[PDB]
Amino acid sequence: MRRELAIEFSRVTESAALAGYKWLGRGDKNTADGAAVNAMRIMLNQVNIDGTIVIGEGEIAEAPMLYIGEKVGTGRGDAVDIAVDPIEGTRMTAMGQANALAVLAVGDKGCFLNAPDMYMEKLIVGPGAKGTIDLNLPLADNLRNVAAALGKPLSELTVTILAKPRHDAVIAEMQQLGVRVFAIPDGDVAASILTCMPDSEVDVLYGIGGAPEGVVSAAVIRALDGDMNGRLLARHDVKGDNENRRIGEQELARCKAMGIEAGKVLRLGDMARSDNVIFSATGITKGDLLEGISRKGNIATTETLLIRGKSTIRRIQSIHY
Template identity: 40%
Template sequence: MPQHDPSDGVAETTVIGAEAWPADLVLAVRSSTAAAALAARAWVGRGDKIAADAAAVAAMRAVVIGAPFSGTVVIGEGEKDAAPMLANGERLGSGQGPECDIAVDPLDGTSLAALARPGAVSVIAIAPRGTMFDPAGVFYMEKLIAGAAGLGVLDLRRSPAANLRAYAAACGIAETSLTVAVLDKPRHASLIRELRAAGATVSLTAEGDVSTAIAAATPGTAIDLVMGIGGTPEGVIAACAVRALGGVMLGRMAPQSEAEARGAHAAGRDLARLFEVSDLVASSRALFASSPVT
């Protein structure tokens, strides 16, 4: 179950999956997002997303560098746009305690923070070493995320409208009662039209697909499903939270340029492969923390 902590100077820090980890490690993970969020908040509304991101990265690194674990960064968000980042392959932690994979985004929603718009968060996830999927060179992924009612019901090979109908039937409600979060990007124009034609409410967000993923996997929130193409690094981070929450997450690589597609093929990626949440994080012992920035 999610745990909320209003301390550390941020409005609320959410921790998911804490029960399976040592208390001192949970505290360090929680404190790392709180520190990153506080550092980024100094840049909110100042129009400089790079400075906000860099401040969050430095603050998070300062905490996790001494955390009681031996961690390797698998997802250092920022590679796709050359943003400040905790680098892939970077070793973090004190070297004492469990061996872990780390996925981080010290500031998910950099533009939201720069413009003082809601939805920017600091997030980190850890899992036992070797259990996180490394997307290596494919920066975008098609995602379909929902609560536990979608297990065995949703299928990326079907149309968005068909998945909407199937999920509504599984929940025992009408399609018109469902709200689908979609990133507000030109690539989603046809998806948005199809969902609206099917009767769903479409909640458009400029950035921050980690937050909407968590909302979709959590019963009783304003978001029922997430659909569309977002970042692969964010997808792996979100998968840790979705798995701990018992939700459903399906994915498929979605290169957004010819160069990215060529790189994927050169790396031996199967672009037709369908991923389930257990493919993105193989362990059920994922630990996730999130602190709001805006």
């Protein structure tokens, strides 16, 4: 402990994944998510930590379970901060599609950036390009710098990015630069980790995705010794000026209340403040990062990726009876 808890945390994501898996292909993203949230909370509440949910399902008002500030754990052990994404890929789960997974990160008290559930522009790279990125520079400059750091031509650089209307221009810009663009339907947490996975052609993740998702990515990227910058963006500034403005202003007032500057570049250490992070993710369906659950009779299998910032990276293939 806390290294002794690594296995306990993997059981939490295995439970969440198996619970979400029950709703795979059932066309109900809310119910799938609720099942995974419930299973994750049940399991966390049997772990010997004094956990606070810092990234989660919503404020107490909108989220009955795993709400921001919720206390979880038996209360024995260390005060830790907890980031949960019980299903990354809820729509993908509802639709029986690839790349759904259950995600948890655990760190020292105060180790995760406290920021609103708003959008964040992200630029994420692996260890081979650590120190070569700066979101204050033009995208094309960053991409050139990263390719040079990795010792490959620009035309071979592979950038992953969410396939969303907000990204039309930048995707076209990158393709014109001659880079390879892997535009993904959802799931920038899992995709961010591919930057640190040698057998994935992905070199960089770039683009606007969920802020809490970006803070989880910062935690795991830090643990893997990659690099990331983020920049918080208000809703109307990413979707267009229309109730976006209303949502946007709540977000900016929240940034101030939490003492965060929106639109300012966040360095890796601004989002994940220490190396003492345990990250666990378990596949629901097969994706680029993890195998999916299988079931034959009364036996089910899961694969879990378990990463500890202090230290080896583990892939745990379990058979459950």
